[PDB]
Amino acid sequence: EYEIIETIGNGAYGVVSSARRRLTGQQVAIKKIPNAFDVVTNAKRTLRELKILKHFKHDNIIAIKDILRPTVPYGEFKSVYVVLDLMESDLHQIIHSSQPLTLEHVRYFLYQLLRGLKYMHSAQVIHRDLKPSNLLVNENCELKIGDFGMARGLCTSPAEHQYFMTEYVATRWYRAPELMLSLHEYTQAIDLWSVGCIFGEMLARRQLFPGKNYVHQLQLIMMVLGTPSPAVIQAVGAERVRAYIQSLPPRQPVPWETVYPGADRQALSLLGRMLRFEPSARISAAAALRHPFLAKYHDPDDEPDCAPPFDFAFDREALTRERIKEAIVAEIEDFHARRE
Ligand SMILES: Cn1cc(NC(=O)c2cc(C(=O)c3c(Cl)ccc(Cl)c3F)c[nH]2)cn1
């Protein structure tokens, strides 16, 4: 049914290969999740991502094109094969390379990212791990958000460690203040912090806050944003961090013009609207698409919401590996039923 071209990916998620459907000739990416059901944690993530990707139909979100059916007896179905959009590169590789990236690239890439988040956010899904390398880009310059392993809804299970240990959620360099400090306000605004970090990175083609560890991360952020306000300092979850921040002299925010000298005025306008300490002070995805910097591409008339919202209830459930296997197989059957 498929003709393998070459291998490209490894690992943590599995193995990725480029391929073509024999009948159509159309090119795809095939991900093998080997021994998919052997570990509960992994199996749970697999089910969560299968449901998420099947839920979205959006040009700026990686899509499942096919899932191969077991052609073996059920008991020997060990590894899962997912067929996905083939994407040549990603935003990290592009930013950190000798490829072009003018203001127009920045503008268009940001536009698509935000377009994808408006959709995803409206379904009540926080990605929680946006970074350049999770944003794939194909030969046509389409940007697609992938890697939904970290994604959660607005109210989650206290049985997960992450519920309390927010400072370990996602990736340090793009991790929102509210996660670092446990500000007890966990919304889609988490993503808009990461977007700001990505935006900044694209403007200078280097990482905005590359802290070596926890404390240095906070220091790097505060070098630009200044010290958090009193109101935020009070809201800090743990005593020692709270105390640490209070131990520093007040610092005034640096205007973005200084951080990124000579950069587009309209770009820094929007950037500033995203990188603020307080979650609810940050611009939303939907509103950022309205900002003058994205004038050129914004079309209210082609930036859909996602109905209905995604429900994360299934993830809360306590299932054995063998039940998770069934649930995943049901999703493969459902995929094909819904088509054929
Ligand atoms: C450099 N290069 C990468 C490819 N592969 C693709 O086309 C491709 C990747 C995806 C993903 O959902 C995805 C995966 Cl599988 C692993 C990790 C992350 Cl972060 C992802 F986003 C979908 N298609 C080919 N070359």
Listed as own residue / partner, the contacts of 211-214 with beta carbons closer than 8 Å and 24 or more positions apart are 211/172, 211/173, 213/172, 214/167, 214/172, 214/180
Ramachandran angles phi, psi of 86, nearest 5° = -85, 125
Tell the residue nearest (CA) to atom 21 of ligand 1.
146
Question: Does the beta carbon of 134 sit less than 6 angstroms from any atom of ligand 1?
Answer: yes
The overall longest dimension of the chain from CA atoms, in Å, is 67
User: Is the dihedral angle over the CA atoms 116, 120, 121, 123 positive or is it negative?
Assistant: positive
Distance, in Å, from the CA atom of 293 to the CA atom of 45, rounded to the nearest integer, reads: 36
221 is in an annotated binding site: no
Strand-strand pairing, 27-33 and 80-84: antiparallel
Contacts of 266 (CB under 8 A, 6+ apart): 291, 292, 293
Exp. method: X-ray
Distance 132 CA to ligand 1 centre (A): 12
Distance, in Å, from the CA atom of 249 to the CA atom of 290, rounded to the nearest integer, reads: 37
208 touches 217 (CB < 8 A): no
14 is in an annotated binding site: yes
Residue with tokens 């499942």: 64
Question: Does the beta carbon of 86 sit less than 6 angstroms from any atom of ligand 1?
Answer: yes
Distance, in Å, from the CA atom of 188 to the CA atom of 120, rounded to the nearest integer, reads: 9
Question: Does the beta carbon of 94 sit less than 6 angstroms from any atom of ligand 1?
Answer: no
Q: State which of 5, 10, 13, 16 you would mutate to test the pocket of ligand 1, scoring each by most atoms of that ligand within 8 A of its C-beta.
A: 16
b vs e for 24-62, b when ≥16 Cβ sit within 10 Å of the residue's Cβ?
eeeebbbbbbeebbeeeebbbbbbbbbbbbebbebebbb
**Other C-beta atoms lying within 10 Å of the C-beta of residue 133:** 15
Distance, in Å, from the CA atom of 177 to the CA atom of 221, rounded to the nearest integer, reads: 9
Reported as type and span, the H/E element at residue 47 is helix 40-55
User: One of 66, 85, 129, 191 is an active-site residue; which one?
Assistant: 129
User: What are 67's strand-pairing partners?
Assistant: 82
Question: Does the beta carbon of 136 sit less than 6 angstroms from any atom of ligand 1?
Answer: yes
**Other C-beta atoms lying within 10 Å of the C-beta of residue 303:** 19
Tell the residue nearest (CA) to atom 16 of ligand 1.
13
Class of domain 89-302: mainly alpha
Question: Does the beta carbon of 9 sit less than 6 angstroms from any atom of ligand 1?
Answer: yes
| 129 annotated active-site | yes
Instruction: Tokens for 144, please give them.
Output: 């697609």
Q: Give SS3 for 82.
A: strand
Nearest CA among 205, 82, 45, 61 for reference residue 143: 61
Query: CA 325, 72, 336 angle in degrees (round to 5)?
Result: 65
Residue by residue, DSSP assigns 103-165 as: HHHHHHHHHHHHHHHHHHHHTT-B-----GGGEEE-TT--EEE---TT-B-SS--TTSGGGT-
Taking each helix axis from N to C terminus, what angle separates 265-274 and 103-122, rounded to the nearest 10 degrees?
Answer: 30
Distance, in Å, from the CA atom of 204 to the CA atom of 145, rounded to the nearest integer, reads: 22
Question: Does the beta carbon of 54 sit less than 6 angstroms from any atom of ligand 1?
Answer: no
- CB-facing half-sphere around the CA of 53: CA atoms within 13 A: 25
Question: Does the beta carbon of 33 sit less than 6 angstroms from any atom of ligand 1?
Answer: no
131 is in an annotated binding site: no
Distance 115 CA to ligand 1 centre (A): 20
Distance, in Å, from the CA atom of 226 to the CA atom of 253, rounded to the nearest integer, reads: 4
Spell out where the chain has E strands. 2-9, 15-21, 27-33, 64-67, 80-84, 89-90, 135-137, 143-145
170 is in an annotated binding site: no
Q: State which of 96, 127, 136 you would mutate to test the pocket of ligand 1, scoring each by most atoms of that ligand within 8 A of its C-beta.
A: 136
Distance, in Å, from the CA atom of 54 to the CA atom of 332, rounded to the nearest integer, reads: 10
